[PDB]
Amino acid sequence: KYENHTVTLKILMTLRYVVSDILKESRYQYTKFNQPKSKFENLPQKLLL
Amino acid sequence: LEVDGITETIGTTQSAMYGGASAQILQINEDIKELLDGLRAYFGYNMIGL
């Protein structure tokens, strides 16, 4: 029925991101309290999407 | 403590005038006082002649 016609739509789509740059990449801490020995842990990174 | 945009702050029960566990000790002392004084009724006072 719509062989030669222009169809227009409004749509919902799921959100998506990709990483363009890494900002404040690595943050650190020598956690020692209430541990058998010293441990190294990586704190949250910040991402620019 | 604040490092590179991430910060943490804590205020503890520890204080110059009271200890950290002082709250529990106060409650325990309260319970014991009622418990002991009431229990002393089960045994009663001590008497001796002269």
Side-chain angles (χ1 to χ4, degrees):
Chain A
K1 303 168 64 175
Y2 314 129
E3 183 179 1
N4 212 333
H5 280 81
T6 45
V7 72
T8 177
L9 297 96
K10 272 166 64 60
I11 174 165
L12 295 192
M13 55 175 278
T14 50
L15 179 59
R16 289 189 293 283
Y17 281 116
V18 291
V19 181
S20 191
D21 276 337
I22 304 183
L23 192 61
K24 295 198 179 191
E25 176 161 24
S26 173
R27 290 181 281 205
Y28 45 85
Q29 167 157 290
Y30 284 149
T31 185
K32 304 196 290 185
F33 175 85
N34 194 3
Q35 299 286 267
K37 64 191 78 177
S38 304
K39 188 188 174 206
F40 186 83
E41 303 194 323
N42 292 88
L43 307 181
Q45 320 198 277
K46 185 197 286 188
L47 310 178
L48 194 150
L49 312 178
Chain B
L1 183 142
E2 166 161 308
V3 168
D4 194 8
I6 188 163
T7 305
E8 175 160 30
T9 294
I10 310 188
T12 62
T13 52
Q14 305 195 51
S15 186
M17 67 207 287
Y18 309 138
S22 55
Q24 290 80 4
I25 305 302
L26 174 58
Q27 178 56 32
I28 293 283
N29 293 337
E30 182 177 296
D31 185 31
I32 283 172
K33 290 274 145 186
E34 176 179 17
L35 177 54
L36 182 61
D37 297 341
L39 184 56
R40 275 174 174 178
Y42 187 56
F43 300 100
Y45 299 157
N46 310 316
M47 185 190 304
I48 185 70
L50 195 79

